[PDB]
Amino acid sequence: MFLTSILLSSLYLFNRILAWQGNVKHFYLFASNLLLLFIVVLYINFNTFSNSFQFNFELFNSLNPFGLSNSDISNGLLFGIDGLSLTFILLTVLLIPLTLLGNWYNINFNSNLYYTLVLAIGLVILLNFWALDYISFYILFEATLPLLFILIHIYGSSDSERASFYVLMFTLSGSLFMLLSIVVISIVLNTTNFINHNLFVLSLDLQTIIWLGLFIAIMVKTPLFPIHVWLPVVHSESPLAGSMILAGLILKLALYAILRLLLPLLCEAQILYTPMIYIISLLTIILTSLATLRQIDLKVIIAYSSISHMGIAILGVCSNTSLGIYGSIVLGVAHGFVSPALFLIVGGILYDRYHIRIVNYYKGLTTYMPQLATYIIILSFANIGTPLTGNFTGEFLSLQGGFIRNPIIGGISCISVLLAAIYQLKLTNKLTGGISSIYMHRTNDVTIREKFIMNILIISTLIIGICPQIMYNLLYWTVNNYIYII
Amino acid sequence: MLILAIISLITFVSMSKLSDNRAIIRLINIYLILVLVLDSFLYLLFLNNQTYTVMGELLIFNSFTFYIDMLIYFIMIVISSLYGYNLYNNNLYKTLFEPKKELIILFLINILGALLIVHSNDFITLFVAIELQSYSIYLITAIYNSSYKASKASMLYFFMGGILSILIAYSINTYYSVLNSYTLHSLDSLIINTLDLNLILIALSLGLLFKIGIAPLHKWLISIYENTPILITIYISLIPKISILSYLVLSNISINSLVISILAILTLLVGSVGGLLQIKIKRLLAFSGLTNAGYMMLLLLLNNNEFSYLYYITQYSISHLAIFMIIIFSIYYINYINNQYNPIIYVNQLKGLIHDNAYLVLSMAIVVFSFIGIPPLLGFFGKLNILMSILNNGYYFISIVLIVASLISALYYLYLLNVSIQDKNNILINSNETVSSVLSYILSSLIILITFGFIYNSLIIDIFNVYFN
Amino acid sequence: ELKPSSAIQRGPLNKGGWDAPHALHNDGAIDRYAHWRTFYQERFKYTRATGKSTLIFLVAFPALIGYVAYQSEGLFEFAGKRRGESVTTR
Amino acid sequence: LPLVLISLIVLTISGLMIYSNDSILINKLLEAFGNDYNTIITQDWFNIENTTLLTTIGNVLLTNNAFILLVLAIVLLLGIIGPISITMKHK
Amino acid sequence: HFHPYNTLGLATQSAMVGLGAGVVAAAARNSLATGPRNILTTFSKSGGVVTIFTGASIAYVFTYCSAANLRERKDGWNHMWAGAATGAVLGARTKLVPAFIGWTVLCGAACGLFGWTGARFNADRKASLEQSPKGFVQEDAHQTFWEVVHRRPLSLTVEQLGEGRGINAVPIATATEAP
Amino acid sequence: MFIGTIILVLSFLGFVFNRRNIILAFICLETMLLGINLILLRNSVLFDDISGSLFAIVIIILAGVESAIGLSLLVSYYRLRGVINSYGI
């Protein structure tokens, strides 16, 4: 009766702010900001001494469909956290007011639609990381895709039709095979669960051919080599919020799903088959970080940059070693900071000022925007993997973990520091230097909100870069929960 | 209590005038509502999959059949709530969508013909009931006589239904020739080993299956669906499909059938690639009928298909019903109206529908995502529970081609949205008259079932467990 | 005699807001260059150069990495070490 | 003609296949023609009244299968309603 | 074990079948058409179908039996090589080389995906959940496919995975013990 | 079973291979039902039962009402047009 009364009051407050105020930009900010105050107090009461799942709730049980349940028979949808599951929630919740802010003075046409869609595809990726069944992980692994389709189609820049079709099609096409491999282990085990499946072994001939259905499902989501067709051409026509929340949140989900789904029940099917993961991760690092060099568009470069770092990260997960797991987690938490800041630089600030994203118009940004050329350089040099930034801690530990498992593939894959410097510094010194361009009237300096976003996304890299241990208190069980070296 | 309605209303419609037809249909609608409300306690008769054979080894009453028997009345209330009720109160909307005098008679004669198949045990009840419902489709099609396409469509449907009726009667006669009995339980699992029955039982299956749109013979049905008026075709696309598919699924005469597996694959191929380059909306919509009626020969190959079937049928019937009612709403906002019987013909015509109203496109978006299996929707678990039975019983290439068919099909489901959320140049600022209240409340309810049926998914599984096992 | 009703009064659609002045002079050559580069795939064809690149980077290079990765699988064990001890396993 | 000359052969031979229960596919066909054997007709004196054929049809349509006659009423009903549903043009 | 195939016998059977399929398809093409046609244009305006039905039917089963004989086993790869030969026949109708290479790769991959699952459009009756031992094991039984246990034997996982990476025949701590 | 199969197959090919009028379709459809009866009634005789004759006396009626319905469908088709075409509907 009490928690019903809270909802009946809050929906009424929402109704009256809809009535008097026109936009709900302010109430969406207020709600998404209170999500921080909630999740940090959840972090305070988090017991770090237990591998255990602390905060558990079932929705949609038989005996109580609309709400919570305490029964001895459970067929609802489980939810909970530990450690691993919690670092990515904390990555999420301090980013969604920044994408909700990110289009503040921008939209001007059906703003109530847009901010509803952005907040909704942020809440769905909160509950992605809360989920505990294979189906409750999966029923929110594609509740994003409708709202992503409509957020790209309406509000996309130009040629947003094709990008919206790609973000439905490729993700769905790789996702149905994940559904196959979930169906097979839900008719063999009769349990969808993230708690018990350490206990259940499978035949190697069974475990072999259900690892395919999940691996070529995460090959699409973190785009590996026969995929990443779609990644740059969903970025290059996205709006501003749906590019930040794509590249900071949707990509790290399959980094989370290769940990949560694959590694602890596919334990014996991987050690036969990690040296296909090393093939695919290396020739995404070698190939996709080499096609960055020849790119006329400016958002497409930061798209392929996201591909190259996510290809470094999944040869730290698939190392079956102890440094690589933590290195890939700190990659996922630091790339999700440094990368949406770059999308604020490319289609955030510069497309708001000049509305065309070809590189060839853009030189001499220093003479009339000095305190943007600083954010060009320190944020680029944060993307390359200069130390003290939190990207290098992740790149270093993941290249080290991938050097344990197979040292020749690690020695070849170490060249990524060079290959990630080449295109990023080539872009940085084209934009930063030269005479201020002919085509370009002088527009405003970078404004107070587009500094307030940036300094948050820069301090949050620098704190991880000075101390990567500020989140070892969470992760030290999940460094061990995934090793099978007997 | 169908025939208590039919015998009464036929005398009632014989004497009423042409103006009274709307209020006659309103009466029959409310009658069917109260037959569903005051008489739906007959679920208690079965409690452990208890089956009754009634009228002397002639009808068969079990709980699968009770659920289909309840489903058909529910969708008939939604269909009859269309002809009863005005869409708008305008000159156009009276001269469009006029119900004929004998239409309400032929609906309930068709429901008698459709119910006496799902409840059927004997072959002679099968044959008399496929004949009763085939006549009713011959005459529901042709009742709009002053239409060129509708008369050509009824005459085509006549001869094709006639060939498949004689093929069924030949199979029934042939099974009688090899075994004295007519009932299907004279099989009782010892015949089929020691007896070559595969050819008879497939020809009995294929006789009904080709009446529905099994894909070597899919070309005639698409033509009939595109040629009838847009309100005959929601009924004559729903009813014969679900009636005979729950027949063929209740009585599993073709297990491991290679002919059925080929034609299942061929259906999933040619439906999903036939709907790709098509500009007419009832076409696109009828091939969406074809692929989804080809997730059906699959379950027909199975044994023990009564969770997957029933869940997917009520999924499909709600989704079907809702998207036809969406384009029946969409005809007010379009700029061009041809062809009085069939007012919207092209999917190019419903452009810019979001700038006219946004919530009809919100409705259209949830139904078109429910067709393509999007996971928080009710249409997802239908494909999920087909796949928990296809893979359960060894059909692995069937599963891969099922997936590829779903992906190729989503490409022409999403064309409806690609058209409907675009800039139009001529937005509506004020409509003077508003759409009928109950006829939009029905679509709102059919949405909220689709978007919130995963709430009650778990209750349904427990209920199911009690009442079919 | 079939016309949408007289009770509509439908008007024009604006997107609303402020006409921002042109901060960029678009260059027709650069615009058609970029429109040619982004939609490059609609006009791509197979030639000898295209086939040579596709033979190397799709077939030969994954096969070379496959040979190196599946042969040199559990060879090296550089954890401690000494002098004269085995550096490999096989 | 070259489709008819295939379909004659195939449809006739296949329509003579299913009267047999072997599993050879040549002994199935050759049981359709291999029947030149004369059935022997005995006299049994068990029947006392001339229940001919039409009496037994009237006993089975009316007791054992009364529902088929009673659904049949609805079919003939429909055969009366249908031509008046179409060919009238009321008012 | 296995039995080698008569390549010539299976090929000439399939040649007769492809002949019959070409004849019935040309008979279908005559009648399902328009314009002036007679008895002789069965093979004049035939569209070249009898060459399709003949050449595919020879090449698939000849390459299939030859590949199954020189590999001396039966798996899904033989369907891959045979579907590559079928794509070579179907690719030669369009007289272009990159088309042809694409037909050979993609039809061969589709036929290999068909062959790997079981080379059946229907199911296998046995060896699937409804007709196969499933669930846990009851005692120290050999864990078959479809079954789960709680702890596999180490001597089995060392035979399957190897003796390299991290996996060893003795766990690492009791291998380093004080006596 | 010869006379029934022959009426069925030849009536079927007389249905399939016409292009000249509409009534040959109707009468070939009617002789197919005759051909089914000719097989059913002899299986009634040779097995010594009425139940094939039960299905016979039912399918007589269904062939009747079939003709009544379908010729009203044709008069629907003819009212709106002028003359039923040679090639078909």
Ligand SMILES: CCCCCCCCCCC(CCCCCCCCCC)(CO[C@H]1O[C@@H](CO)[C@H](O[C@@H]2O[C@@H](CO)[C@H](O)[C@@H](O)[C@@H]2O)[C@@H](O)[C@@H]1O)CO[C@H]1O[C@@H](CO)[C@H](O[C@@H]2O[C@@H](CO)[C@H](O)[C@@H](O)[C@@H]2O)[C@@H](O)[C@H]1O
């Ligand atoms: C997610 C995308 C990945 C796509 C994977 C699809 C392909 C999966 C195929 C693998 C699989 C289905 C399992 C599927 C289950 C999950 C499917 C998941 C999604 C399905 C989409 C089909 O296995 C087929 O494999 C083919 C080639 O490999 C063979 O080809 C053919 O070969 C020739 C005749 O043999 C033909 O003459 C030739 O014409 C064909 O060429 C077939 O024989 C074979 O049946 C394996 O099933 C079978 O496995 C075997 C053990 O091997 C099991 O028996 C075991 O015997 C002892 C041995 O220890 C032990 O007692 C025990 O262990 C177990 O009792 C069986 O119980 C059975 O179950």
Ligand SMILES: CCCCC/C=C\C/C=C\CCCCCCCC(=O)O[C@H](COC(=O)CCCCCCCCCCCCCCC)COP(=O)([O-])OCC[N+](C)(C)C
């Ligand atoms: C007061 C009325 C006002 C006027 C309303 C008029 C018509 C309302 C008609 C339908 C409303 C929905 C009722 C659904 C009943 C399902 C029974 C059942 O799950 O069936 C199960 C088995 O199903 C199956 O195999 C699978 C079916 C899967 C259904 C898939 C869609 C379901 C998701 C939404 C449906 C539930 C929404 C609930 C909304 C509150 C058998 O159990 P049963 O036969 O004993 O249940 C009927 C008992 N009864 C008659 C007293 C109610």
